Amino acid sequence: MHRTYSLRNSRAPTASQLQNPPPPPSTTKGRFFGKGGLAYSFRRSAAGAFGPELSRKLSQLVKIEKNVLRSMELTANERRDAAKQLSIWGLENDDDVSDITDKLGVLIYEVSELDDQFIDRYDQYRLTLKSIRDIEGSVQPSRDRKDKITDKIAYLKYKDPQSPKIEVLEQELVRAEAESLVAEAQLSNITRSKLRAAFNYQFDSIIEHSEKIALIAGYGKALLELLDDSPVTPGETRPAYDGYEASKQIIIDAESALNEWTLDSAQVKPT
Amino acid sequence: MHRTYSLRNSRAPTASQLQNPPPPPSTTKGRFFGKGGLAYSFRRSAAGAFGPELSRKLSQLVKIEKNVLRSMELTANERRDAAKQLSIWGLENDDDVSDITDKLGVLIYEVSELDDQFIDRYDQYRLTLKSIRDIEGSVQPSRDRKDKITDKIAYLKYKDPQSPKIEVLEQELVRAEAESLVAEAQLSNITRSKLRAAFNYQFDSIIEHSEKIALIAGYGKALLELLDDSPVTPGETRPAYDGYEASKQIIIDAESALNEWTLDSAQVKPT
């Protein structure tokens, strides 16, 4: 949607893009459907199946959100595995390198834990959407019966103008219309309420998790200053790294700001 | 319809019935359908067949009238045969008896000739009814097409409210309605005209033929006075019959009144 007014689907570069040019496209693009294969697309296909034809789209969205959740669960546990592997690799290295890589590993572990909490809040969002899907599916048969009744009464009117069955189904249809009006009014109310609440909670969760992980990334950037990037000539060895206390103080302050973080202290501000 | 207010289909006796009691029912009632058999009922059955379903009753009436005409033709020629046979029988009898029976035979021949003329006028009536039947049969397909078109447009309205075919058939049906209104107006006019003219002519024909045959019967009753009903004793013979001139004068006067008869000289008068 950010594409410029040209013939190319090229997004307009932001100030960050001008500051640092965008990198080349990733080489990880594999020759695959990109939906987890037929095994993971079985759920997607089953979403588009014999349903109430009304919550079909909503049920499909819910099951797609379940796929989202499964993928995020896959990238959280295996990311914390990556952090563990990074610490294991940094075990046998320079003392400053080992300390700094262990601190980066623990920061990534914090990242994975926040991802898991975001996953739980995502499941709350998905459960609210499941509730709205189920109430919509329960309210659909009312309108289905309404459509069937109006079609049958139209056919009966075609057959003759004085069948008692005609008047009886008209009398039942005036009841069905009122019940369907009430059902659709409450359906609109519940859909609006669930939609607003679920998406407000979802956006609050994502902004909280994202600003928290950004607060973590800033602390990690500050921590990365401890190691010295000055190259050392072959032969003599550089002085030993004694910044253990500084790194521990940095991680302590990061923990303190992490625990102190609250919705009131949301330094992110729109304009 | 002349039956009294009782539980029996016994007609109220008129003054003639009081004057002379009614005779016993005829013994000529045969064990038969009374419609000329299946050969003569084939036409009646074919009248009730694949027709325009409107002139079906009128065509059936016309063919029944044809059966009427055939039966009347059968009883006219064979009645004149009966008159010839009566003259042949009276050939060998008393002179007065022979003369009087020959005069009765010629009166019956006049009766048969008047019957034949009545048959021709009956055929005029039947031809007028054939004309009205044929115009009604020609006007029926208009209303048949109207009914078919309205049924089809009702079904098309059931299917959807915006088919172009719907509006096109509505535009053709508003034309068909006007043409059917004109057709039914002219149909009513022609039916009334043909009905009134044909039945007025039929009733004039029947009253003319009937009053003429009654005028004949009165002359025959006057003529029957010539013969003597006084019994003669065995032995001597009664004086010879010389009333030939009187009988010839009676028949001459009957011929004169027959030729002089006109619609103006219709001595029959209703009240």
3-class SS string, chain B: CCECCCCCCCECCCHHHHHCCCCCCCCCCCCCCCCCHHHHHHHHHHHCCCCCCCCHHHHHHHHHHHHHHHHHHHHHHHHHHHHHHHHHHHCCCCHHHHHHHHHHHHHHHHHHHHHHHHHHHHHHHHHHHHHHHHHHHHHHHHHHHHHHHHHHHHHHHHHCCCCHHHHHHHHHHHHHHHHHHHHHHHHHHHHHHHHHHHHHHHHHHHHHHHHHHHHHHHHHHHHCCCCCCCCCCCCCCCCCCCCHHHHHHHHHHHHHHHHHCCCCCCCCCCC
What would the two tokens of residue B202 be? Answer: 């039929």
| A contacts of B154 (beta carbons < 8 Å) | 158
| B contacts of A154 (beta carbons < 8 Å) | 158
Torsion of CA B20, B22, B24, B27, to 10 degrees: 110
> Does B158 reach chain A within 8 Å, measured CB to CB?
yes
B154 and A158 in contact by Cβ < 8 A?
Answer: yes
> H/E/C letters for each residue in B104-142?
HHHHHHHHHHHHHHHHHHHHHHHHHHHHHHHHHHHHHHH
C-alpha atoms less than 13 angstroms from C-alpha of B89 in its C-beta half-sphere: 10
Q: What angle do CA B243, B248, B252 make, to 5 degrees?
A: 150
Give the largest Cα separation in chain A, rounded: 110
Euclidean distance between the first and the last CA atom of chain B, given in angstroms as a whole number: 21
Q: Which of A157, A158, A159 to mutate to test the interface with B (most CBs of B within 10 A)?
A: A158
Distance CA A224, CA B161 (A): 73
A71-110 burial by CB neighbour count: b if 16+ within 10 A, else e? eeeeebeeebeebeeebeebeeeeebebbbbbbbbebbeb
Task: Kindly report the nearest CA distance between residue A155 and chain B, in angstroms.
Answer: 8
Residue of A nearest to B156 (CA): A158
> Does B160 reach chain A within 8 Å, measured CB to CB?
no
Give the distance from CA A266 to its chain's centroid.
20
Torsion of CA B106, B107, B108, B110, to 10 degrees: 90
Distance CA A154, CA A222 (A): 76
Residue pair B102/B90 in contact (Cβ under 8 Å)? The answer is yes
| A contacts of B158 (beta carbons < 8 Å) | 154-155, 158
Residue B3, beta-bridge partner list: B11
Instruction: Provide φ and ψ at A11, rounded to 5°.
Output: -70, 150
Listed residue (A89, A79, A98) closest to A247, CA to CA: A98
> Does A155 reach chain B within 8 Å, measured CB to CB?
yes
> Does B50 reach chain A within 8 Å, measured CB to CB?
no
Distance CA A94, CA B165 (A): 88
- CA-CA-CA-CA torsion sign (B158, B161, B166, B170): positive
**Integer angstrom CA distances of residue A91 from A62, A83, A107, A243, B161:** 43, 12, 16, 17, 79
**Integer angstrom CA distances of residue B146 from A34, B143, B191, B263:** 63, 5, 21, 48
Torsion of CA A138, A143, A145, A147, to 10 degrees: -160
> Does B154 reach chain A within 8 Å, measured CB to CB?
yes
A155 and B158 in contact by Cβ < 8 A?
Answer: yes
Give start and end residues of each alpha helix (H) in chain A: 15-19, 37-47, 56-90, 95-159, 164-223, 244-260
What would the two tokens of residue A230 be? Answer: 């000055």
Give the distance from CA B46 to its chain's centroid.
22
Euclidean distance between the first and the last CA atom of chain A, given in angstroms as a whole number: 21
What would the two tokens of residue A229 be? Answer: 């990037």
> Does A89 reach chain B within 8 Å, measured CB to CB?
no
Listed residue (A58, A95, A79) closest to A194, CA to CA: A58
Task: Kindly report the nearest CA distance between residue A152 and chain B, in angstroms.
Answer: 11
Question: In the block, which residue shows the tokens 């997607």?
Answer: A44
What would the two tokens of residue B147 be? Answer: 């009914």
Distance CA B219, CA A66 (A): 120
Residue pair B104/B147 in contact (Cβ under 8 Å)? The answer is no
Q: Which residues lie below 8 Å from residue A10, measured CB to CB, with a gap of 6+?
A: A3, A4
- Name the resolution in angstroms: 3.6
Residue of B nearest to A154 (CA): B158
> Does A232 reach chain B within 8 Å, measured CB to CB?
no
Distance CA A13, CA A3 (A): 9
A154 and B158 in contact by Cβ < 8 A?
Answer: yes
| B contacts of A158 (beta carbons < 8 Å) | 154-155, 158
Residue A112, beta-bridge partner list: none
Would you mind telling me the total number of residues written for chain B in this entry? 271
Task: Kindly report the nearest CA distance between residue A176 and chain B, in angstroms.
Answer: 21
Listed residue (B232, B220, B224) closest to B96, CA to CA: B224
Residue pair A90/A105 in contact (Cβ under 8 Å)? The answer is yes
Task: Kindly report the nearest CA distance between residue A163 and chain B, in angstroms.
Answer: 18
Instruction: Provide φ and ψ at B263, rounded to 5°.
Output: -60, -35
| A contacts of B160 (beta carbons < 8 Å) | none
Elucidation method: cryo-EM
Instruction: Provide φ and ψ at A132, rounded to 5°.
Output: -65, -35
> Does B155 reach chain A within 8 Å, measured CB to CB?
yes
| A contacts of B155 (beta carbons < 8 Å) | 158
Q: Which residues lie below 8 Å from residue B208, measured CB to CB, with a gap of 6+?
A: B263, B266
Question: In the block, which residue shows the tokens 């949607």?
Answer: A1
Instruction: Provide φ and ψ at A4, rounded to 5°.
Output: -75, 180
Residue of B nearest to A153 (CA): B158
| B contacts of A151 (beta carbons < 8 Å) | none
- CA-CA-CA-CA torsion sign (A206, A212, A213, A217): positive
Residue of A nearest to B152 (CA): A158
Task: Kindly report the nearest CA distance between residue A55 and chain B, in angstroms.
Answer: 27
Question: In the block, which residue shows the tokens 């995502």?
Answer: A122
B50-67 burial by CB neighbour count: b if 16+ within 10 A, else e? ebbebbbebbbebbebbe
Q: Which residues lie below 8 Å from residue A62, measured CB to CB, with a gap of 6+?
A: A47, A126, A129, A130, A133
Looking at this protein, which amino acid is placed at residue B230? S
| B contacts of A155 (beta carbons < 8 Å) | 158
DSSP state of A260: H
Task: Kindly report the nearest CA distance between residue B120 and chain A, in angstroms.
Answer: 50
B155 and A158 in contact by Cβ < 8 A?
Answer: yes
Helix axes B95-159, A95-159, angle to 10 degrees: 160
| A contacts of B161 (beta carbons < 8 Å) | none
Task: Kindly report the nearest CA distance between residue A164 and chain B, in angstroms.
Answer: 20
Residue of A nearest to B158 (CA): A154
Distance CA A53, CA A141 (A): 10
A118 burial type by CB count under 10 A (0-12 exposed, 13-18 middle, 19+ buried): buried
Question: In the block, which residue shows the tokens 């003569």?
Answer: B40
Task: Kindly report the nearest CA distance between residue B150 and chain A, in angstroms.
Answer: 11
Inter-chain contacts counted by CB atoms under 8 A, chains A and B = 5
